[PDB]
Structure formats: C-alpha cells, structure tokens
Amino acid sequence: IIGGTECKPHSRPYMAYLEIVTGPSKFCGGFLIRRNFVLTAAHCAGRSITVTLGAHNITEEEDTWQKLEVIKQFRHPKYNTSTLHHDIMLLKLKEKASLTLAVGTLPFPSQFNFVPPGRMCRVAGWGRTGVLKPGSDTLQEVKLRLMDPQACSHFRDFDHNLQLCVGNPRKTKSAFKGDSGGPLLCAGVAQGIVSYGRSDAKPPAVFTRISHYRPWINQILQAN
Amino acid sequence: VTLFVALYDYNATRWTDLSFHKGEKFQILEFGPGDWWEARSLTTGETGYIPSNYVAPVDSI
Numbered sequence A: 001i002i003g004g005t006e007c008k009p010h011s012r013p014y015m016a017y018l019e020i021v022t023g024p025s026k027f028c029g030g031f032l033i034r035r036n037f038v039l040t041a042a043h044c045a046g047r048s049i050t051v052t053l054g055a056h057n058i059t060e061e062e063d064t065w066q067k068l069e070v071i072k073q074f075r076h077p078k079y080n081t082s083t084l085h086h087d088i089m090l091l092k093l094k095e096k097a098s099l100t101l102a103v104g105t106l107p108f109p110s111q112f113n114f115v116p117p118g119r120m121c122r123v124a125g126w127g128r129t130g131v132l133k134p135g136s137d138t139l140q141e142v143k144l145r146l147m148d149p150q151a152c153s154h155f156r157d158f159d160h161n162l163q164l165c166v167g168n169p170r171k172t173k174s175a176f177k178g179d180s181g182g183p184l185l186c187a188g189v190a191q192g193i194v195s196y197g198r199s200d201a202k203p204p205a206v207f208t209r210i211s212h213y214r215p216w217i218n219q220i221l222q223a224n
Numbered sequence B: 001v002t003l004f005v006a007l008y009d010y011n012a013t014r015w016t017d018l019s020f021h022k023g024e025k026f027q028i029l030e031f032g033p034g035d036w037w038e039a040r041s042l043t044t045g046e047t048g049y050i051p052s053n054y055v056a057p058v059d060s061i
Helices: A210-223
Strands: A015-021 A026-034 A037-040 A050-052 A066-075 A089-093 A120-125 A140-145 A162-164 A183-186 A189-196 A205-208 B003-006 B025-030 B036-041 B047-051 B055-056
Touching: A015 A037, A026 A189, A037 A189, A037 A210, A050 A089, A089 A210, A120 A189, A162 A189, A189 A210, A205 A210
Parallel strands: none
Antiparallel strands: A015 A026, A015 A050, A026 A037, A037 A089, A050 A066, A066 A089, A120 A140, A120 A183, A162 A205, A183 A189, A189 A205, B003 B025, B003 B055, B025 B036, B036 B047
C-alpha cells in the first residue's frame, strides 16, 4: 500500500494474509467471506497456501492469530494471464475459523450492486509501501478514488463490467505488489479485489469487480 | 522440473510480471492459462509471469 497509514490493529478482522509455496514462498492478501472460505486474486495460486487470520504485525505471532491450511483452490475457469481478466479465486480452508473480535467475515455484494466512478473506497494490505521498499510488517490502509474506465485505457482489454479502475492518477496513493487479493471497501461492502497495476506504481490500478462474480461465488459455496 | 532460458532482456510493465536478462533460467510452473507463463527465476528466486516468446526450452534436462 503506497501513501497509506497503519490500520488501527484488528479493525479489519476479515483480512487474510496468504503464504503461497511453489522452494521460496510468495505472499498475497485476501479476505474471509465464510468461516472456511477466503476470497483472493487468481494470480496468487500456487501448490500450497497457508492463510493467517487475526494479524496486524505479520511478523509477530499473537493471541488473535488463527493459522489454517488451504485444502482446495477454486480459480475462476476463464482467468487469462494476458489480460488478467477474471482474476478471482476462492480458497477453502481445512477447518472453520472462529469468529472473534479480531477474525470476521466481510459481506460480498449483490450482482445488481454496480458501484459507479467518483466515490472513495478503502483498501488494505501488507504489500510494498514504495517501488523499491520491503513489504509492510503491519497492515496498512489507504483511501482511493474510483475512476472513469477511460483512465485505465492503457491497460489491456480493460473491461468496465469486469474490473474497477482505482486511484486518482494525480496522487501517489495506490495498492501495489503484495496487496494483490485484498478487498476494496466502499461504504462497508467488499466491491473490489486488488488485481494488478503498473510496475512503477503510478495509479490507477485494476481491481476485479466482485459484483459481476456473485453467481460464480454462489456456485462454489453451495457445492462446498 | 521444466527449465527455460531467456533469449532477450525484458522489462516488466505490470507488477505481476518478472523483469529479466538475456540468458537467465526459469523453472516454468504453469504454461498459462494464456500466453504469459508463471515462472520462477533461477537467478533471483522471484515468481511471476513471463512472456512466452522471450524464452525457449533448455537443450536437455
């Protein structure tokens, strides 16, 4: 998260931290939508994933942590690495999380819920806080602006029905590497999933528009 | 293990993609889905997408 601030610890209890193992491990964000399901981006998939719920400082084990293996990865069947269309994945956990003050689920939207350009939303994560900086040890958050789809026209086959365009280009505030898979919240509802953006971190970035994927989410949850 | 070698330098434009140098070796983790491949660099240990035409199979493994 670039240009953000440290979250009040445990104020976003749905936040999930993903350690993905392939040798050396990669890292992503995600968020709890059911006690045993984490939503994230499709490009965070790997051979095995570990989810840590209840964290603020990811390097310090605390009382609030719940640390769970993923038993099944449900990547969207139409995900494509050329366009990164449908960059959405559901992770089924080995056991159900316990709901506490520090671990909770985030509602996801109705398909009719189409969030327009112009409004301010919030995204959080443990990613890099600059182009050349390390991942943040502590969960960080930033307020960003939803942009007209025209401002993401430099991105390949940007599709407004599928994808949100996030981050006023006149500012430096942005999600970045490591934030991928994390939720974008507008008025308390998960509307977006951090997907991708420019290597130089110049906003806006592309988020998956969760509302479009509501029926696909339904079919995964009901079969599992 | 599937090893490929870069034939050209490449500078990533999307944060999901690796930057690399002609001659660098890669373990390919998935051939897609699509024309960008998930790969781990044997030089830097980073994981990400690489354009498939910038690389070629190593001679023998």
